[PDB]
Short mmCIF file of all heavy atoms in Angstrom, two decimals:
data_model
loop_
_atom_site.label_atom_id
_atom_site.label_comp_id
_atom_site.label_asym_id
_atom_site.label_seq_id
_atom_site.Cartn_x
_atom_site.Cartn_y
_atom_site.Cartn_z
N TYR A 1 -17.00 6.24 -54.83
CA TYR A 1 -18.16 7.01 -55.43
C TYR A 1 -17.87 7.58 -56.74
O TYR A 1 -16.63 8.02 -56.96
CB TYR A 1 -18.52 8.12 -54.30
CG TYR A 1 -18.81 7.59 -52.96
CD1 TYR A 1 -17.74 7.42 -51.97
CD2 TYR A 1 -20.05 7.46 -52.52
CE1 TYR A 1 -18.01 6.97 -50.77
CE2 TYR A 1 -20.40 7.03 -51.37
CZ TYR A 1 -19.36 6.78 -50.38
OH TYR A 1 -19.67 6.34 -49.07
N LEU A 2 -18.89 7.95 -57.48
CA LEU A 2 -19.04 8.94 -58.45
C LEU A 2 -19.33 10.21 -57.92
O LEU A 2 -20.50 10.42 -57.50
CB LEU A 2 -19.99 8.57 -59.61
CG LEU A 2 -20.18 9.64 -60.70
CD1 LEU A 2 -18.80 10.00 -61.33
CD2 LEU A 2 -21.09 9.13 -61.82
N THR A 3 -18.39 11.28 -57.73
CA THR A 3 -18.60 12.49 -57.08
C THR A 3 -18.76 13.64 -58.13
O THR A 3 -17.95 13.79 -59.05
CB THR A 3 -17.44 12.89 -56.14
OG1 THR A 3 -17.35 11.84 -55.22
CG2 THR A 3 -17.55 14.23 -55.45
N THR A 4 -19.98 14.33 -58.12
CA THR A 4 -20.36 15.41 -59.04
C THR A 4 -20.44 16.72 -58.29
O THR A 4 -21.40 16.76 -57.36
CB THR A 4 -21.62 15.02 -59.70
OG1 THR A 4 -21.42 13.65 -60.16
CG2 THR A 4 -22.03 15.97 -60.89
N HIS A 5 -19.70 17.73 -58.61
CA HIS A 5 -19.82 19.16 -58.07
C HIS A 5 -20.59 20.04 -59.04
O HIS A 5 -20.07 20.52 -60.01
CB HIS A 5 -18.42 19.76 -57.83
CG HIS A 5 -17.53 18.78 -56.98
ND1 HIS A 5 -17.58 18.58 -55.66
CD2 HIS A 5 -16.49 18.03 -57.29
CE1 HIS A 5 -16.69 17.83 -55.24
NE2 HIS A 5 -15.97 17.43 -56.25
N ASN A 6 -21.93 20.16 -58.81
CA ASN A 6 -22.76 21.04 -59.67
C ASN A 6 -22.62 22.39 -59.00
O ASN A 6 -23.30 22.69 -57.92
CB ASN A 6 -24.31 20.59 -59.66
CG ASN A 6 -25.10 21.39 -60.65
OD1 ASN A 6 -24.68 22.42 -61.15
ND2 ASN A 6 -26.29 20.87 -61.01
N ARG A 7 -21.93 23.41 -59.77
CA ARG A 7 -21.70 24.73 -59.28
C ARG A 7 -22.65 25.71 -60.06
O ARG A 7 -22.42 26.94 -59.95
CB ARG A 7 -20.24 25.18 -59.63
CG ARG A 7 -19.16 24.00 -59.20
CD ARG A 7 -18.48 24.24 -58.07
NE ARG A 7 -17.12 23.56 -58.06
CZ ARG A 7 -16.62 23.08 -56.99
NH1 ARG A 7 -17.08 23.24 -55.77
NH2 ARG A 7 -15.38 22.51 -57.08
N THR A 8 -23.67 25.27 -60.69
CA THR A 8 -24.61 26.07 -61.43
C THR A 8 -25.95 26.08 -60.68
O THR A 8 -26.07 25.39 -59.60
CB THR A 8 -24.94 25.44 -62.86
OG1 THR A 8 -25.74 24.33 -62.69
CG2 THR A 8 -23.59 25.06 -63.58
N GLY A 9 -26.78 27.01 -61.00
CA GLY A 9 -28.22 27.24 -60.42
C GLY A 9 -29.22 26.30 -60.96
O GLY A 9 -30.46 26.57 -60.63
N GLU A 10 -28.82 25.35 -61.88
CA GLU A 10 -29.86 24.44 -62.49
C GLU A 10 -29.42 23.03 -62.28
O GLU A 10 -28.19 22.69 -62.14
CB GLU A 10 -29.94 24.68 -63.96
CG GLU A 10 -30.30 26.13 -64.35
CD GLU A 10 -29.09 27.05 -64.25
OE1 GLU A 10 -27.97 26.77 -64.60
OE2 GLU A 10 -29.32 28.24 -63.89
N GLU A 11 -30.37 22.06 -62.11
CA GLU A 11 -30.12 20.56 -61.88
C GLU A 11 -29.43 19.96 -63.12
O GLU A 11 -29.79 20.31 -64.20
CB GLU A 11 -31.53 19.84 -61.63
CG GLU A 11 -31.28 18.49 -61.12
CD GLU A 11 -32.62 17.65 -61.05
OE1 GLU A 11 -33.24 17.47 -62.13
OE2 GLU A 11 -32.98 17.21 -59.98
N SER A 12 -28.44 19.13 -62.79
CA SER A 12 -27.70 18.39 -63.83
C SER A 12 -28.08 16.90 -63.66
O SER A 12 -28.30 16.43 -62.45
CB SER A 12 -26.28 18.59 -63.79
OG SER A 12 -25.55 17.83 -64.66
N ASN A 13 -27.97 16.11 -64.67
CA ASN A 13 -28.16 14.63 -64.70
C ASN A 13 -27.45 14.08 -65.99
O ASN A 13 -27.19 14.80 -66.90
CB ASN A 13 -29.66 14.36 -64.62
CG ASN A 13 -30.01 12.87 -64.39
OD1 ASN A 13 -29.20 12.23 -63.93
ND2 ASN A 13 -31.25 12.53 -64.56
N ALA A 14 -27.19 12.72 -65.86
CA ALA A 14 -26.57 12.01 -66.91
C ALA A 14 -27.58 11.08 -67.64
O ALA A 14 -28.24 10.37 -67.01
CB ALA A 14 -25.41 11.10 -66.49
N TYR A 15 -27.77 11.27 -68.94
CA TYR A 15 -28.75 10.45 -69.73
C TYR A 15 -27.89 9.25 -70.27
O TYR A 15 -27.23 9.61 -71.43
CB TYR A 15 -29.45 11.35 -70.77
CG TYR A 15 -30.52 12.23 -70.08
CD1 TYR A 15 -30.11 13.27 -69.27
CD2 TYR A 15 -31.83 11.94 -70.40
CE1 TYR A 15 -31.14 13.99 -68.67
CE2 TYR A 15 -32.77 12.71 -69.82
CZ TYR A 15 -32.42 13.86 -68.93
OH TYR A 15 -33.47 14.59 -68.39
N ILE A 16 -28.00 8.11 -69.79
CA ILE A 16 -27.23 6.93 -70.09
C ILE A 16 -27.47 6.56 -71.52
O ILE A 16 -28.74 6.50 -71.91
CB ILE A 16 -27.63 5.79 -69.18
CG1 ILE A 16 -27.51 6.00 -67.65
CG2 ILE A 16 -26.66 4.54 -69.51
CD1 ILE A 16 -26.13 6.44 -67.18
N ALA A 17 -26.41 6.25 -72.33
CA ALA A 17 -26.50 6.01 -73.73
C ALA A 17 -27.23 7.02 -74.43
O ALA A 17 -27.81 6.72 -75.59
CB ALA A 17 -27.09 4.62 -74.04
N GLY A 18 -27.27 8.26 -73.80
CA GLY A 18 -27.74 9.53 -74.62
C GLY A 18 -29.26 9.77 -74.40
O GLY A 18 -29.66 10.89 -74.78
N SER A 19 -30.02 8.88 -73.73
CA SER A 19 -31.48 8.81 -73.88
C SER A 19 -32.14 8.57 -72.44
O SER A 19 -33.20 9.16 -72.20
CB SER A 19 -31.94 7.78 -74.79
OG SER A 19 -31.44 6.56 -74.66
N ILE A 20 -31.49 7.74 -71.56
CA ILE A 20 -32.09 7.34 -70.31
C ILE A 20 -31.56 8.08 -69.15
O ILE A 20 -30.43 7.99 -68.75
CB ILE A 20 -31.75 5.72 -70.06
CG1 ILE A 20 -31.91 4.87 -71.24
CG2 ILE A 20 -32.53 5.22 -68.90
CD1 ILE A 20 -31.32 3.48 -71.20
N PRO A 21 -32.53 8.94 -68.54
CA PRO A 21 -32.05 9.74 -67.33
C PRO A 21 -31.74 8.71 -66.23
O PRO A 21 -32.45 7.82 -66.10
CB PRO A 21 -33.29 10.50 -67.04
CG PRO A 21 -34.44 9.75 -67.60
CD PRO A 21 -33.84 9.10 -68.80
N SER A 22 -30.60 9.03 -65.44
CA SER A 22 -30.19 8.24 -64.26
C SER A 22 -31.14 8.61 -63.14
O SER A 22 -31.87 9.78 -63.34
CB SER A 22 -28.74 8.60 -63.92
OG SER A 22 -28.76 9.74 -63.08
N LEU A 23 -31.11 7.93 -62.05
CA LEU A 23 -32.01 8.20 -60.77
C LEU A 23 -31.25 9.04 -59.86
O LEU A 23 -31.74 9.23 -58.77
CB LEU A 23 -32.30 6.82 -60.16
CG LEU A 23 -33.21 5.84 -61.07
CD1 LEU A 23 -32.92 4.41 -60.83
CD2 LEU A 23 -34.68 6.25 -60.81
N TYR A 24 -30.01 9.55 -60.23
CA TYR A 24 -29.12 10.29 -59.19
C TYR A 24 -28.68 11.59 -59.86
O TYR A 24 -27.49 11.92 -59.98
CB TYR A 24 -27.91 9.34 -58.92
CG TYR A 24 -28.25 7.87 -58.74
CD1 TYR A 24 -27.68 6.95 -59.65
CD2 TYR A 24 -29.01 7.44 -57.66
CE1 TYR A 24 -27.99 5.65 -59.55
CE2 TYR A 24 -29.23 6.11 -57.53
CZ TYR A 24 -28.82 5.18 -58.42
OH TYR A 24 -29.01 3.90 -58.29
N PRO A 25 -29.67 12.55 -60.11
CA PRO A 25 -29.32 13.80 -60.69
C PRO A 25 -28.54 14.59 -59.55
O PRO A 25 -28.88 14.34 -58.34
CB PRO A 25 -30.65 14.45 -61.01
CG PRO A 25 -31.64 13.82 -60.12
CD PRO A 25 -31.14 12.41 -60.07
N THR A 26 -27.57 15.56 -59.91
CA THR A 26 -27.01 16.44 -59.00
C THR A 26 -27.60 17.84 -59.03
O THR A 26 -27.64 18.45 -60.08
CB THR A 26 -25.45 16.63 -59.36
OG1 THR A 26 -24.95 15.26 -59.55
CG2 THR A 26 -24.71 17.32 -58.29
N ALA A 27 -28.34 18.11 -57.89
CA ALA A 27 -29.04 19.44 -57.67
C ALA A 27 -28.14 20.56 -57.79
O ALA A 27 -26.92 20.45 -57.73
CB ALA A 27 -29.90 19.40 -56.36
N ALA A 28 -28.64 21.88 -57.92
CA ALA A 28 -27.90 23.11 -58.10
C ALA A 28 -27.20 23.47 -56.81
O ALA A 28 -27.58 23.13 -55.81
CB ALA A 28 -28.92 24.23 -58.44
N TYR A 29 -25.94 24.04 -57.11
CA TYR A 29 -24.97 24.46 -56.01
C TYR A 29 -24.81 23.43 -55.02
O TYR A 29 -24.76 23.67 -53.70
CB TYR A 29 -25.47 25.81 -55.38
CG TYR A 29 -25.65 26.90 -56.40
CD1 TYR A 29 -26.91 27.67 -56.44
CD2 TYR A 29 -24.70 27.30 -57.34
CE1 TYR A 29 -27.22 28.57 -57.29
CE2 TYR A 29 -24.90 28.33 -58.27
CZ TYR A 29 -26.19 29.05 -58.26
OH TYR A 29 -26.36 29.96 -59.13
N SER A 30 -24.66 22.23 -55.47
CA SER A 30 -24.61 20.95 -54.58
C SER A 30 -23.59 19.97 -55.08
O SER A 30 -23.42 19.95 -56.37
CB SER A 30 -25.96 20.30 -54.55
OG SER A 30 -26.96 21.09 -54.08
N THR A 31 -22.81 19.28 -54.19
CA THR A 31 -21.98 18.08 -54.42
C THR A 31 -22.87 16.84 -54.18
O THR A 31 -23.53 16.90 -53.07
CB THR A 31 -20.68 18.14 -53.76
OG1 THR A 31 -20.05 19.38 -54.24
CG2 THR A 31 -19.85 16.92 -54.02
N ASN A 32 -22.77 15.83 -54.99
CA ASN A 32 -23.48 14.55 -54.76
C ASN A 32 -22.61 13.45 -55.08
O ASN A 32 -21.81 13.57 -56.01
CB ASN A 32 -24.87 14.41 -55.57
CG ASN A 32 -25.73 13.32 -55.12
OD1 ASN A 32 -26.03 13.03 -54.03
ND2 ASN A 32 -26.09 12.33 -56.13
N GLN A 33 -22.63 12.40 -54.26
CA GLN A 33 -21.68 11.16 -54.32
C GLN A 33 -22.59 9.91 -54.42
O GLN A 33 -23.23 9.62 -53.43
CB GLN A 33 -20.78 11.11 -53.12
CG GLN A 33 -19.85 12.36 -52.91
CD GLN A 33 -19.02 12.20 -51.63
OE1 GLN A 33 -19.59 12.60 -50.59
NE2 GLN A 33 -17.92 11.59 -51.71
N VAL A 34 -22.33 9.23 -55.54
CA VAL A 34 -23.19 7.90 -55.78
C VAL A 34 -22.21 6.75 -55.54
O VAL A 34 -21.20 6.60 -56.22
CB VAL A 34 -23.70 7.92 -57.21
CG1 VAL A 34 -24.56 6.74 -57.59
CG2 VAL A 34 -24.59 9.20 -57.53
N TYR A 35 -22.62 5.79 -54.65
CA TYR A 35 -21.89 4.51 -54.32
C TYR A 35 -21.67 3.89 -55.62
O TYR A 35 -22.58 3.90 -56.62
CB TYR A 35 -22.79 3.70 -53.38
CG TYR A 35 -22.09 2.56 -52.73
CD1 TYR A 35 -21.06 2.71 -51.90
CD2 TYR A 35 -22.49 1.25 -53.14
CE1 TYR A 35 -20.47 1.70 -51.25
CE2 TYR A 35 -21.81 0.20 -52.48
CZ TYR A 35 -20.83 0.37 -51.62
OH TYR A 35 -20.21 -0.67 -50.98
N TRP A 36 -20.53 3.27 -55.80
CA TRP A 36 -20.01 2.75 -57.07
C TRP A 36 -20.82 1.65 -57.67
O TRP A 36 -20.99 1.56 -58.83
CB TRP A 36 -18.57 2.34 -56.97
CG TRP A 36 -17.86 2.39 -58.26
CD1 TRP A 36 -17.47 1.13 -58.91
CD2 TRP A 36 -17.60 3.39 -59.12
NE1 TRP A 36 -16.87 1.54 -60.24
CE2 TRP A 36 -17.01 2.95 -60.34
CE3 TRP A 36 -17.80 4.83 -59.00
CZ2 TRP A 36 -16.60 3.82 -61.30
CZ3 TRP A 36 -17.42 5.67 -59.99
CH2 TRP A 36 -16.78 5.14 -61.20
N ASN A 37 -21.33 0.66 -56.76
CA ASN A 37 -22.32 -0.38 -57.19
C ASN A 37 -23.61 0.14 -57.79
O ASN A 37 -23.96 -0.44 -58.90
CB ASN A 37 -22.67 -1.39 -56.03
CG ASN A 37 -21.67 -2.40 -55.82
OD1 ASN A 37 -21.17 -2.97 -56.77
ND2 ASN A 37 -21.61 -2.83 -54.66
N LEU A 38 -24.15 1.22 -57.33
CA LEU A 38 -25.28 1.97 -57.93
C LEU A 38 -24.94 2.37 -59.32
O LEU A 38 -25.73 2.12 -60.19
CB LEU A 38 -25.69 3.12 -56.99
CG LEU A 38 -26.22 2.70 -55.67
CD1 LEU A 38 -26.81 3.94 -54.99
CD2 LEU A 38 -27.36 1.71 -55.79
N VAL A 39 -23.79 2.90 -59.56
CA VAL A 39 -23.30 3.41 -60.84
C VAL A 39 -23.27 2.21 -61.85
O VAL A 39 -23.94 2.28 -62.88
CB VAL A 39 -21.83 3.99 -60.81
CG1 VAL A 39 -21.25 4.22 -62.19
CG2 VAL A 39 -21.79 5.24 -59.93
N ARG A 40 -22.52 1.11 -61.42
CA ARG A 40 -22.45 -0.09 -62.20
C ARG A 40 -23.82 -0.51 -62.79
O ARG A 40 -23.98 -0.79 -63.88
CB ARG A 40 -21.74 -1.23 -61.43
CG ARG A 40 -20.24 -1.06 -61.11
CD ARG A 40 -19.72 -2.13 -60.35
NE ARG A 40 -18.24 -1.99 -60.12
CZ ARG A 40 -17.34 -2.25 -61.06
NH1 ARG A 40 -17.76 -2.73 -62.28
NH2 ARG A 40 -16.00 -2.17 -60.90
N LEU A 41 -24.91 -0.53 -61.86
CA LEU A 41 -26.20 -0.88 -62.20
C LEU A 41 -26.91 0.11 -63.14
O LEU A 41 -27.55 -0.38 -64.09
CB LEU A 41 -27.01 -1.01 -60.83
CG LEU A 41 -26.70 -2.28 -60.00
CD1 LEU A 41 -27.48 -2.20 -58.72
CD2 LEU A 41 -26.98 -3.54 -60.74
N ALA A 42 -26.75 1.44 -62.83
CA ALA A 42 -27.26 2.45 -63.74
C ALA A 42 -26.84 2.18 -65.15
O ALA A 42 -27.51 2.45 -66.12
CB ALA A 42 -26.77 3.88 -63.21
N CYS A 43 -25.59 1.70 -65.37
CA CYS A 43 -24.89 1.39 -66.54
C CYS A 43 -25.11 -0.05 -67.11
O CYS A 43 -24.65 -0.28 -68.24
CB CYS A 43 -23.40 1.66 -66.51
SG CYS A 43 -22.91 3.45 -66.64
N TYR A 44 -25.83 -0.95 -66.36
CA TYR A 44 -26.19 -2.28 -66.72
C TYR A 44 -27.02 -2.31 -68.05
O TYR A 44 -27.99 -1.55 -68.13
CB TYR A 44 -26.98 -3.04 -65.57
CG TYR A 44 -27.32 -4.40 -66.06
CD1 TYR A 44 -26.54 -5.47 -65.98
CD2 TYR A 44 -28.60 -4.63 -66.47
CE1 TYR A 44 -26.88 -6.71 -66.44
CE2 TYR A 44 -29.03 -5.93 -66.82
CZ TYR A 44 -28.17 -6.96 -66.80
OH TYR A 44 -28.55 -8.19 -67.15
N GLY A 45 -26.48 -3.05 -69.00
CA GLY A 45 -27.02 -3.23 -70.35
C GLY A 45 -26.44 -2.15 -71.41
O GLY A 45 -26.76 -2.44 -72.57
N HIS A 46 -25.72 -1.17 -70.86
CA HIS A 46 -25.04 -0.20 -71.71
C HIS A 46 -23.58 -0.27 -71.73
O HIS A 46 -22.92 0.79 -72.10
CB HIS A 46 -25.66 1.22 -71.27
CG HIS A 46 -27.12 1.21 -71.11
ND1 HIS A 46 -27.74 1.20 -69.86
CD2 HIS A 46 -28.13 1.16 -72.01
CE1 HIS A 46 -29.00 1.14 -69.97
NE2 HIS A 46 -29.26 1.18 -71.38
N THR A 47 -22.99 -1.34 -71.17
CA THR A 47 -21.57 -1.45 -70.84
C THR A 47 -20.94 -2.43 -71.71
O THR A 47 -21.55 -3.66 -71.78
CB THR A 47 -21.38 -1.63 -69.34
OG1 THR A 47 -21.87 -0.67 -68.59
CG2 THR A 47 -19.76 -1.89 -68.91
N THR A 48 -19.92 -2.12 -72.46
CA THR A 48 -18.98 -3.00 -73.31
C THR A 48 -17.61 -2.64 -72.95
O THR A 48 -17.31 -1.46 -72.99
CB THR A 48 -19.45 -2.76 -74.75
OG1 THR A 48 -19.19 -1.39 -75.06
CG2 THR A 48 -20.81 -3.21 -75.11
#
């Protein structure tokens, strides 16, 4: 998994290649774990 510990009071998210929001934001005061295959796909077309 990609494990993200959001310890803030605001939602966090990764904007792929700086512009594209992922479908797996980490909500406030929450840990979220994204299955590795889902990660690979989120990065599909942006991977070299």
Side-chain angles (χ1 to χ4, degrees):
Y1 302 85
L2 176 54
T3 304
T4 309
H5 311 281
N6 189 346
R7 317 257 204 213
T8 78
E10 305 80 34
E11 192 189 57
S12 175
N13 195 12
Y15 285 69
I16 307 295
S19 51
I20 313 167
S22 88
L23 294 149
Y24 320 115
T26 311
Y29 303 128
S30 302
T31 301
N32 190 52
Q33 296 176 274
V34 181
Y35 193 65
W36 201 250
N37 268 329
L38 292 189
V39 171
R40 290 180 175 283
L41 287 175
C43 281
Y44 175 79
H46 312 106
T47 302
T48 58

